[PDB]
């Protein structure tokens, strides 16, 4: 019995808890962009749209005796909005395994859920770094008001240091001086692990002093690619309405399908706080 009908919930409370903990742990081990981006407060599942403010140019403060200067930014004539998507992945559970776990106390195995969570995290990172042409989203490597600098030769040591100082100078010439963060592909990240004879240490350690907010690697980046960003809530952030969670989809062919899902969007308010190599 209990497999001869159609149920609302096929699992017990402890199994639900274990499933959720597994999903959370895999996500925390796999995510990257949440280490360099701030999170605009979590809104709720009912919220499906957020404002998309875009600022251009440089506007500085003022120093004077009597405060009779404007020094205020103006709203865009348009003030566009954008829609928050859904990112999800599905997995399956067989009913005879559940039957064994309840008749002869054999522990339940949830490795398919871990696989689905890993794939969902990879999808989120792909959406952050590149965009979505059919949905009209832009990523960090495809923004239009972004700065660019040539990569140069990294086969010999010192090439990495030359490119990151040039990128920081280009970001300097636009009014952005905050702590920088660097993200690289595996070829560049591995090539930065040699000894620099001009310093006597590993080349990665000088760039870690230059950045001071982090040097990371991501397998979403293609070939030899890298990005340097100036961090801060006023330049870019992540608006999330619902964090990663799991949901039962209803029985089909006597088996049990589930979904892991989340809802978030990336907001780039200052497109010149980026620089791609």
């Amino acid at each position: 019995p209990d497999f001869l009908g159609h149920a609302e919930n096929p699992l017990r409370e402890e199994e639900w808890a274990r499933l959720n903990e597994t999903v959370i742990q895999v996500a925390r081990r796999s995510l990257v962009g949440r280490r360099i981006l701030d999170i605009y407060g979590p809104l709720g599942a009912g919220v499906q749209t957020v404002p998309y403010d875009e600022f251009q140019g440089v506007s500085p403060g003022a120093v004077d005796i009597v405060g009779e200067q404007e020094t205020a930014m103006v709203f865009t004539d348009a003030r566009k909005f954008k829609t928050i998507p859904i990112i999800y992945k599905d997995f399956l559970l067989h009913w005879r395994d559940i039957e064994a776990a309840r008749t002869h106390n054999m522990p339940l195995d949830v490795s398919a859920a871990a696989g689905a969570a890993a794939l969902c995290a990879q999808q989120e990172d792909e959406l952050i770094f590149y965009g979505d042409a059919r949905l009209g989203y832009e990523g960090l490597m495809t923004a239009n008001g972004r700065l660019t600098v040539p990569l140069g030769d990294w086969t010999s040591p010192g090439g990495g240091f030359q490119a990151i100082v040039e990128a920081t100078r280009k970001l300097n010439e636009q009014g952005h001086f905050g702590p920088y963060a660097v993200v690289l592909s595996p070829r560049l990240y591995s090539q930065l692990h040699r000894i620099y004879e001009k310093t006597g240490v590993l080349e990665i350690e000088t760039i870690r002093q230059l950045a001071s907010d982090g040097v990371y690697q991501s397998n979403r980046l293609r070939g030899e690619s890298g990005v340097v960003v100036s961090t801060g809530r006023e330049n870019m952030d992540l608006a999330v309405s619902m964090d990663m969670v799991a949901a039962y989809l209803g029985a089909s062919r006597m088996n049990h399908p589930f979904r892991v899902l989340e809802a978030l969007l990336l907001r780039i308010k200052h497109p010149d706080a980026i620089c791609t190599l």
Partner: peptide, 10 residues
């Protein structure tokens, strides 16, 4: 109450 799960990683 609405809460985060994975949470902030900064």
């Amino acid at each position: 109450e609405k809460r985060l799960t994975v949470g902030s990683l900064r």
